[model samples]
Target: SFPTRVYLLRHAKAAWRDFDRGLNEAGFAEAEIIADLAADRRYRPDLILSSTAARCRQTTQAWQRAFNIDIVYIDEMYNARSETYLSLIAAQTEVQSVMLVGHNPTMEATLEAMIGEDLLHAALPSGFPTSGLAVLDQNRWRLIDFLAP
Candidate 1:
């Protein structure tokens, strides 16, 4: 069984004016919270993958500041599904931890796949929103915790 710990991060709130726009005021504040969380040892990742969307990249800025790591951007992930997310996790052979900063539906779907529909619903009643995070232990891949900004 893979011992990978997958951190699924939903890109922060976006500006509807542009399809590829970055985060707005609230989203920027959310990014700051992520920086604090990473700085305080609450969250860390061995590798980071993000959607090609500007919002996703911007959302990762705080993490980059805290971890000083280069994020690998995946264009396909901008509109990917849970299967794509699973394949991304399975493709990793070196890192024990991976973080994917992407959109919803896929992220929400992946959380359900990892933790089961019931738990996923219980954990995220409002659905995965901007900066929502789900930590999973890939051996069984159950949700360890869920965080949102």
Candidate 2:
């Protein structure tokens, strides 16, 4: 059986704003690069769930454009805790691959929860960077790959 793939994507670099902010120039470029990289690597996610915040939305837009996949925007993801991310992920039983475009340390927390603290540290010793994508096998709780720009 094919393992369920979960892609935990942290939004690209963004401008600082009290409420909501969109990606800056470098952020836009990073988004495009990561999308293309995923496409080139054939990391075709069956479903994409993104936060409703401007930065997360913008990050998801690039992947949607590249893959021509649909997106579901979730408001809770903007300031969500790790459990919210896990519950959302655990709810997806129909799709082979699910990608979440949101923020962190929630993203990092989610990854750590899935793969454990040791694997998490092994994969990201320097810490999770902006626009970093953590690819994991949900069933196995194993890290498959990580892409960053």
Candidate 3:
């Protein structure tokens, strides 16, 4: 059986002292590049949700604009826990594919929750980088084929 596809992404790098907590120049480029890497039939998302944080919004906004889709910003995403990600996935009512742009630790843990720790660390030993995207097809998870800047 085909599993539901859930895309989890960590926000790009933030400025050293940005008061609004926005992404840096490199972060924007990473977001654009990530959008390209995830743009395909298998990667298409039916719905998008993102943290209200400026960096997260910026990252997802690029992809949202690329696919001409809209993203709902969630306040909880900024400080959400791994269980929050699980509940969000469980609450999917209509959309088969969903993309979430948010922060780390939680993002990494969420990936581990769906795909297991061995695989998560195997695929991302250095931890979830800025603009990293984790694709989960039901019980299976795969990191996208990332390209160089």
TM-score for all predictions? 0.89, 0.91, 0.84
Sort every candidate by lDDT, greatest first: 2, 1, 3
Clashes of each: 0, 0, 0
Task: Pick the winner on TM-score between candidates 2 and 3.
Answer: 2
Cα displacement (angstroms), candidate 2, residue 20, comes to: 1.9
Query: What's the true lDDT of residue 73 in model 1?
Result: 86
Candidate 2 stretches with Cα past 4 Å from truth are 1-3, 81-84
Worst 10 residues of 3 by lDDT: 140-149
Candidate that would win on TM-score: 2
Error of 3 at 60 (Å): 1.4
- Pairs that collide in candidate 1 are none
Local distance difference test values of all predictions, in order: 0.78, 0.83, 0.73
Query: In order, what is each prediction's RMSD in angstroms?
Result: 2.0, 1.9, 2.9
Q: At residue 91, what lDDT does model 1 achieve?
A: 83
Q: Residue 140 lDDT in model 3?
A: 53
- lDDT: which candidate is best? 2
